[PDB]
Structure formats: C-alpha cells, structure tokens
Amino acid sequence: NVLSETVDQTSPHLSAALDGVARFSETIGKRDEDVKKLLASANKVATVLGDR
Amino acid sequence: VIKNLNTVLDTTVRHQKQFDETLVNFETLITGLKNRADPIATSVADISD
C-alpha cells in the first residue's frame, strides 16, 4: 500500500524530472572524451598550483 | 566552456615545467626585492630628484 500511494503521489511530477535529467545528462554524456581530457589537464595544472 | 578550457589547459600543460619553475623564480625574486624594498624605493626617489 505504501508503494502504491507513493507512486500515486509522485507520478505527475516525474516526467518533467526525467526530461530535465535526461537533457542535462546528455549535455555531458556526448562530451565524454573532452571531459576526461579536461580533468587530466586540470589535474596536471592544479597539482602544479597546489605544490607551489 | 569545455572546449576553450581544454585549449587553455593543454597550452599550459605543454609548458608545464616552465610554468612550475616560473612561480618559484618569481617568488624568490620578489622576496629578495622585498627584503630591500626600502633602500630600493629610497634610491628610485633620489634618482628622480
């Protein structure tokens, strides 16, 4: 009964969240190599900055 | 943002050893000048006068 009522309550507010999360996740997911290279370069530069 | 930060970061990484050396060299130069800043400023003022 708890699962039934929870799904009943939070259903109309679900499709918007799914669409928003899908769009924001696809913003980064179609740039995987760029993000990983950016993180590697940032690691190098930030290690240089932090050590000094 | 990702593209241009990638460009800037790879440019910085290409010269990473120089970029690390210049911070320490600049710090040493600035500390050496600060240890005698008062004579330096006095001398520049006297030169102008």
CSV table of C-alpha atoms in Angstrom, one decimal:
chain,number,residue,atom,x,y,z
A,1,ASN,CA,0.0,0.0,0.0
A,2,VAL,CA,2.9,2.4,0.8
A,3,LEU,CA,4.5,1.8,-2.6
A,4,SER,CA,1.1,2.2,-4.3
A,5,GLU,CA,0.4,5.5,-2.6
A,6,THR,CA,4.0,6.8,-3.2
A,7,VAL,CA,3.8,6.1,-6.9
A,8,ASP,CA,0.3,7.7,-7.0
A,9,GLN,CA,1.6,10.9,-5.3
A,10,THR,CA,4.9,11.4,-7.1
A,11,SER,CA,3.7,10.4,-10.6
A,12,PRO,CA,2.6,13.7,-12.1
A,13,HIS,CA,5.9,15.3,-11.1
A,14,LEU,CA,8.1,12.6,-12.7
A,15,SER,CA,8.1,13.2,-16.5
A,16,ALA,CA,9.4,16.7,-16.1
A,17,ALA,CA,12.2,15.5,-13.8
A,18,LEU,CA,13.0,12.6,-16.3
A,19,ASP,CA,13.2,15.0,-19.2
A,20,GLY,CA,15.4,17.6,-17.3
A,21,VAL,CA,17.8,14.9,-16.0
A,22,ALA,CA,18.0,13.4,-19.5
A,23,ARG,CA,18.8,16.7,-21.1
A,24,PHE,CA,21.4,17.7,-18.5
A,25,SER,CA,23.0,14.3,-18.6
A,26,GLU,CA,23.2,14.2,-22.4
A,27,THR,CA,24.9,17.6,-22.2
A,28,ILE,CA,27.9,15.9,-20.6
A,29,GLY,CA,27.5,12.4,-22.0
A,30,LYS,CA,28.1,13.5,-25.6
A,31,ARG,CA,31.4,15.1,-24.4
A,32,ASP,CA,33.0,12.1,-22.6
A,33,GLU,CA,36.4,12.3,-24.1
A,34,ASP,CA,36.5,16.1,-23.8
A,35,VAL,CA,35.5,15.9,-20.1
A,36,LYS,CA,38.1,13.3,-19.3
A,37,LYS,CA,40.9,15.2,-21.1
A,38,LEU,CA,39.8,18.3,-19.3
A,39,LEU,CA,40.0,16.5,-16.0
A,40,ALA,CA,43.5,15.2,-16.8
A,41,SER,CA,44.8,18.6,-17.8
A,42,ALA,CA,43.2,20.2,-14.8
A,43,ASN,CA,44.9,17.6,-12.6
A,44,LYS,CA,48.3,18.5,-14.0
A,45,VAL,CA,47.8,22.3,-13.7
A,46,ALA,CA,46.2,22.1,-10.3
A,47,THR,CA,48.9,19.8,-9.0
A,48,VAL,CA,51.4,22.4,-10.2
A,49,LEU,CA,49.5,25.2,-8.5
A,50,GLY,CA,49.0,23.3,-5.2
A,51,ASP,CA,52.6,22.2,-4.8
A,52,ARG,CA,53.8,25.8,-5.1
B,1,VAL,CA,33.5,26.3,-21.9
B,2,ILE,CA,34.8,22.7,-22.1
B,3,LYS,CA,36.4,23.4,-25.5
B,4,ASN,CA,38.1,26.6,-24.6
B,5,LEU,CA,39.2,25.4,-21.2
B,6,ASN,CA,40.6,22.3,-22.9
B,7,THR,CA,42.6,24.6,-25.3
B,8,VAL,CA,44.0,26.8,-22.5
B,9,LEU,CA,44.8,23.8,-20.2
B,10,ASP,CA,46.7,21.9,-22.9
B,11,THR,CA,48.6,25.0,-23.8
B,12,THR,CA,49.5,25.3,-20.1
B,13,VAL,CA,50.4,21.6,-19.8
B,14,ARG,CA,52.7,21.9,-22.9
B,15,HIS,CA,54.9,24.4,-20.9
B,16,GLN,CA,54.2,22.7,-17.5
B,17,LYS,CA,57.8,22.5,-16.4
B,18,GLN,CA,58.4,26.2,-17.2
B,19,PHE,CA,55.1,27.1,-15.6
B,20,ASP,CA,56.2,25.4,-12.4
B,21,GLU,CA,59.7,26.9,-12.5
B,22,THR,CA,58.5,30.5,-13.0
B,23,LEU,CA,56.3,30.6,-9.9
B,24,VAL,CA,59.3,29.7,-7.7
B,25,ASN,CA,61.6,32.0,-9.5
B,26,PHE,CA,59.2,34.9,-9.3
B,27,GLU,CA,58.7,34.2,-5.6
B,28,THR,CA,62.4,34.2,-5.0
B,29,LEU,CA,62.9,37.4,-7.0
B,30,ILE,CA,60.0,39.2,-5.2
B,31,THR,CA,61.2,38.1,-1.7
B,32,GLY,CA,64.7,39.3,-2.5
B,33,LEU,CA,63.4,42.6,-3.6
B,34,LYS,CA,61.1,42.9,-0.6
B,35,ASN,CA,63.9,42.3,1.8
B,36,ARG,CA,65.5,45.6,0.5
B,37,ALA,CA,62.3,47.4,-0.7
B,38,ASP,CA,63.0,50.5,1.5
B,39,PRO,CA,66.5,51.2,0.0
B,40,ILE,CA,65.1,50.4,-3.5
B,41,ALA,CA,62.3,53.0,-3.1
B,42,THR,CA,64.6,55.5,-1.5
B,43,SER,CA,67.1,55.1,-4.3
B,44,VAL,CA,64.4,55.4,-7.0
B,45,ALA,CA,63.2,58.6,-5.4
B,46,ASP,CA,66.7,60.0,-5.1
B,47,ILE,CA,67.3,59.2,-8.8
B,48,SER,CA,64.2,61.1,-9.8
B,49,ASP,CA,65.1,64.1,-7.5
